[PDB]
Amino acid sequence: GLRRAEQNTEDGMSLIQTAEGYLQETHEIVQRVRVLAVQAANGIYSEEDRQQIQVEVSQLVDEIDRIASQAEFNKMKLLTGAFARLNPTASMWFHIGANMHQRERVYIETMNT
Amino acid sequence: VSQLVDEIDRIASQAEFNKMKLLTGAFARLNPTASMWFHIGANMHQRERVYIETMNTAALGLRNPTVLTFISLSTAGKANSVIGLCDDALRVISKQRADLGAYYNRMEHAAKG
Numbered sequence: 001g002l003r004r005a006e007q008n009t010e011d012g013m014s015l016i017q018t019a020e021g022y023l024q025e026t027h028e029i030v031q032r033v034r035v036l037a038v039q040a041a042n043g044i045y046s047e048e049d050r051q052q053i054q055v056e057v058s059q060l061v062d063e064i065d066r067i068a069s070q071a072e073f074n075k076m077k078l079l080t081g082a083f084a085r086l087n088p089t090a091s092m093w094f095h096i097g098a099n100m101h102q103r104e105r106v107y108i109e110t111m112n113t
Numbered sequence: 114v115s116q117l118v119d120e121i122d123r124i125a126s127q128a129e130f131n132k133m134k135l136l137t138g139a140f141a142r143l144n145p146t147a148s149m150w151f152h153i154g155a156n157m158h159q160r161e162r163v164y165i166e167t168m169n170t171a172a173l174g175l176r177n178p179t180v181l182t183f184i185s186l187s188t189a190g191k192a193n194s195v196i197g198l199c200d201d202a203l204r205v206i207s208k209q210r211a212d213l214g215a216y217y218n219r220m221e222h223a224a225k226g
Contacts, residue, residue, distance in 0.1 A: 025226035032218070048204055052211040059215035067226060070159045 001098025012094035012106075019078045019108060022071045026079075026111060029060050061113055068112035081110030118170055118183045125169035138167035153223050163216055166209055173202040 039045075040053045071079040082090045085107050092106040125136035133139070140149040142164045149163040170176035175198055176183045184195045 022226050025222050028225075029222060048207075052207060055208070055211045056215035056218065059219050063219045063222060066153075066161065066223075070154050070156070072155065 005095065005097050005102070008094060009096045012096065015073045015078075016106070018073045019071065022067055022079060023111065026064055026067055029064055033057055033060055064113045068110075071111070078108055079111035081112075083108040084110060114184070114186050118175065121170050121173075121175075125167070128168075135165050136168040138169075138172070140165045141167055151220070153220075161219075164212070166205075166212075168206065168209060173205055174198055175202050 036053055036056065040050050045053075068079040069077075071077065076082075082088065083092045083106065092108070093103045094106060095103045097103065126134070128134060128136040139145065139147050140163060145164075149165070150160045151163065152160050154160065166172065170183055171178045171181075184191075184198060186192045186195060
């Protein structure tokens with residue numbers, strides 16, 4: 001059980017390590033919107049140019065949604081809000097012990113736009 | 114101008130990727146003859162669609178979509194009128210390249226996660 005408890009603990013971290021890997025791509029997108037918002041906020045552009053800026057954001061706005069819906073570890077949805085705290089549709093418990101209740105619970109909030 | 118306009122038409126009809134035309138209007142949104150989806154997931158419905166508008170002299174407004182007459186600079190008065198159309202035409206190409214690059218960044222991020 002302790003040998004079993006150890007093997008689960010690595011698997012628990014692998015799930016945790018992956019969701020943070022998906023959040024890495026999400027964070028780089030939001031900054032890219034942020035810098036484009038600075039250029040878009042300058043006063044020397046017209047409606048046409050800022051619309052071209054809005055073109056790239058809408059592609060990026062959807063790409064954040066794509067990561068949120070398609071983020072999976074072992075066929076499990078992670079960033080869609082299942083493992084949240086307020087209204088959870090599932091509970092994630094990592095069993096790091098050799099006995100009945102030797103487990104700890106994990107929370108992941110919604111990560112869509 | 115005829116030599117220039119002719120080359121624009123040769124561009125759209127001969128622009129190919131993997132023996133598939135792109136600029137002809139095959140993958141547009143309104144009335145497409147085909148849809149372009151990129152498979153970017155580990156599951157079935159993890160895919161995204163690409164829209165490429167038509168980019169010939171007809172779709173740019175520099176050619177009549179019905180009679181197929183293109184712009185003429187033979188008269189000074191008409192030249193002042195072609196200027197407004199080139200403003201109209203370049204906005205569409207600028208709109209489309211901003212479209213593709215928005216997708217291009219979307220894919221470049223997608224590979225990272």
